[PDB]
């Protein structure tokens, strides 16, 4: 309705005025007095070889040693990052995986893609071989991201413009999250795991309540589709990555854009973004074959992680924040520290 | 140096590495084709000739070559978000319904799709095996309704061969790269010979890729 559209615009204007009223200063302005972090030189400590196709997703285990990586050759390889040893090599039924998740307990590993099925794999089996514990079907679009709340329930975001909370035991969607106009491309679980945020192709990120089972806030500002999203370690803010070559920090409480991380020399799109343990550093993977380390409070490009021959598709930071691993389309998964 | 368990874990890693390499060598010889039509373009007919949701894998062997045909017909979402999955596809098999030039425009939508796919930044060094299906129906459709209804400024006689040749010429357009080659072929209902021209097209594309890698192309 035209009246309801004018009401929606009036609410947006009221909202922007409410932010501007509470925006007495900016993040750049307030953090002008703090000492800027000195230039960071991170060396490639280890290179993980074995993949024979473009790596699309990787996720660190909670022990900060084991990590799983998904590639287009239809293989999930679980690496011992410390020794570069292969703990597992799981053949995939559909060799079109675009996301992979490692359970917080370290018992299960989930993957999916164009098959529209979030295949879950049990590692701790008595037979001693990794087998498909459950195949979660119901999404009508390509699966983009999946994240484990615990060993029982998993939240997944698909290309049908819908995020879905599943129960792995029963094997259907416990709760369905709808509202996105474009395809949802990313997920991020808050430290408390009470709320999660998802960025979609409609150039907007929406905050969702897991228990309630519907959206809470919607954050706009991006000029193009969002590819990645990640919460701030404290769990009150989150950063996003899009194709317009800009990272954008948003605050759950303020309900607005706080800072922009855009350099004029960068025009290529952003694939994946991640924070440090303290949250002072923001690491974003770009299509120019190198990841850039941004100061979360200065927006100054602190360092550049270069060495990959193709697009850096994914990167992950360990729970103890000891190292950073970046996976690229050159079938290599390098670890930086 | 390494303990008994660390050495046993290294041996397991070496065994996995060997298995991955063997599986890689076995899968490297397979030819990968992306079947990409537009609704009732004759995707179901051609895939039936060669041989719930998600892409449909159709693998068939023909003259010491294992062709893998990917039929994406479930993903109704924006293409660009999954087009980058098929970087190393050998050729793109595009299907077009010739009979659907006037009835709906359907041909315009097919031209717009082909324009988008052929000029995609991911599909630059990838040849297109274009199939102009349902030419038997077009045989009498052209004699009843003139082709000018769909495409204006045709400025030609309304017969079978020339009309199909003009559509082929328009489809051969929108190709701004010199490394691409469009292997246009017109098929009707059932021929039992489309697998041969696909093989003939693929082996030409492989020869072209080999000469490019050598440095003669």
């Amino acid at each position, epitope marked *: 309705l035209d009246q309801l559209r004018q009401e929606a615009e009036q609410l947006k204007n009221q909202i922007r005025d409410a932010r501007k009223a509470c925006a007495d200063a900016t993040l750049s302005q307030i953090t002008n007095n703090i000492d800027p972090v000195g230039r960071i030189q991170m060396r490639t400590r280890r290179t993980l070889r074995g993949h024979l196709a473009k790596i699309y997703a990787m996720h660190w285990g909670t022990d900060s*040693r*084991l990590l799983v990586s998904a590639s287009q050759d239809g293989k999930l390889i679980i690496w*011992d990052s410390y*020794t570069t*040893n292969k*703990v*597992h090599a799981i053949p995939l039924r559909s060799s079109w995986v675009m996301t992979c998740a490692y359970a917080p307990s*370290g018992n299960y590993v989930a993957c999916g893609g164009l098959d529209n099925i979030c295949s879950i794999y049990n590692l*701790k089996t*008595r*037979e*001693g*071989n990794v087998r498909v514990s459950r195949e979660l079907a119901g999404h009508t679009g390509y699966l983009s991201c999946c994240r484990f709340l615990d060993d029982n329930q998993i939240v997944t975001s698909s290309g049908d413009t819908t995020c879905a909370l599943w129960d792995i035991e029963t094997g259907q969607q416990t709760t369905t999250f709808t509202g996105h106009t474009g395809d949802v491309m990313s997920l991020s679980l808050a430290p408390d795991t009470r709320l999660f945020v998802s960025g979609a192709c409609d150039a907007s990120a929406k905050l969702w309540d897991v228990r309630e089972g519907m959206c809470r806030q919607t954050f706009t500002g991006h000029e193009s589709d969002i590819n990645a999203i990640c919460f701030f370690p404290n769990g009150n803010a989150f950063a996003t990555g899009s194709d317009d070559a800009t990272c954008r920090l948003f605050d759950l409480r303020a309900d607005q854009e706080l800072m922009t991380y855009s350099h004029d020399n960068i025009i290529c799109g952003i694939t994946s973004v991640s924070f440090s343990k303290s949250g002072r550093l923001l690491l974003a993977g770009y299509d120019d074959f190198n990841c850039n380390v941004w100061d979360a409070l200065k927006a100054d490009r602190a360092g550049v992680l270069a060495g990959h021959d193709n697009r850096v598709s994914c990167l992950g930071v360990t729970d103890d924040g000891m190292a950073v691993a970046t996976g690229s389309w050159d079938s290599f998964l390098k670890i930086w520290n | 140096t390494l*303990s*008994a*368990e*660390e*050495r*046993a*874990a290294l*041996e*397991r890693s070496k*065994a996995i590495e060997k298995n991955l390499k063997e599986d890689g060598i076995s899968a490297a010889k397979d030819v990968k084709l992306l079947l990409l039509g537009a609704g009732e373009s004759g995707k179901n007919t051609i895939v039936k000739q060669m041989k719930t949701t998600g892409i449909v894998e159709t693998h068939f062997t023909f003259k010491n070559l294992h062709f893998r045909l990917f039929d994406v017909g479930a993903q109704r979402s924006e293409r660009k978000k999954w087009i980058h999955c098929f970087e190393d596809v050998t050729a793109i098999i595009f299907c077009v319904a010739l009979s659907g030039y006037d009835q709906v425009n359907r041909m315009h939508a097919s031209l717009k799709l082909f324009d988008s796919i052929c000029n995609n930044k991911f599909f630059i060094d990838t040849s297109i095996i274009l199939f102009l299906n349902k030419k038997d129906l077009f045989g009498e459709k052209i004699k009843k309704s003139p082709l000018t209804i769909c495409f204006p400024e045709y400025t030609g006689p309304n017969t079978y061969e020339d009309a199909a040749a003009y559509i082929q010429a328009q489809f051969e357009s929108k190709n701004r790269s010199p490394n691409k080659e469009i292997y246009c072929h017109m098929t009707c209902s059932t021929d039992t010979n489309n697998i041969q021209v696909v093989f003939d097209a693929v082996t030409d594309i492989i020869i072209a890729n080999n000469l490019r890698g050598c440095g003669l192309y």
Partner: single-chain antibody
Amino acid sequence: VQLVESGGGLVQPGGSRKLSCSASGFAFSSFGMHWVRQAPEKGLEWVAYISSGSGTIYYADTVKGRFTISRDDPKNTLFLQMTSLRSEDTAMYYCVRSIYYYGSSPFDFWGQGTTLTVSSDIVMTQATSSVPVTPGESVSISCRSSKSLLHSNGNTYLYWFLQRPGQSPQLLIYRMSNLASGVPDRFSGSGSGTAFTLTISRLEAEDVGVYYCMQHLEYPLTFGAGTKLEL
């Protein structure tokens, strides 16, 4: 998941034998397999080991050359070709599974074993023997090593096994701390370098048995004397 060993009976000292173990219910191909023998009125003793794919084979110094271990992946069968026999070779030969990756628990499952009768190294010791304990209170079992098991990587390769009377040994604790799957939370192992302690919070009826502390720093693998718990 089960292992069924075959071959045994009365054997002449000059004769030869071939013990075959049939593995079923699990992926035998990816599991390294050990042979552990137990002489009557004597603790466990490591005999031989063959890895997944038959890539690495190790033997004890007492059976080097005499015995020949082998595996058949297609039919999932493990063989132990005993060429020369002696009077001290009599024992209950157990076939044990062993999977080796980061976070794995080797020696987790043991076979039933077959009674065969015939007509330098890390000196793992306990110095405990029989320990009479009533059910209900806590239990402390001490094992000691002549060499420090704390390797530079940062884990101590110690393994506690529970052999109930008239039953095969069961893995309790692996790497001194981690409890095996199915083992209640009562059991808890501790130690530092050389001296190690196995502690049970409460003792029940099924806890009665013999406890063996095996090191896994380097082959040959050495078992403890065997601490017996009873009323």
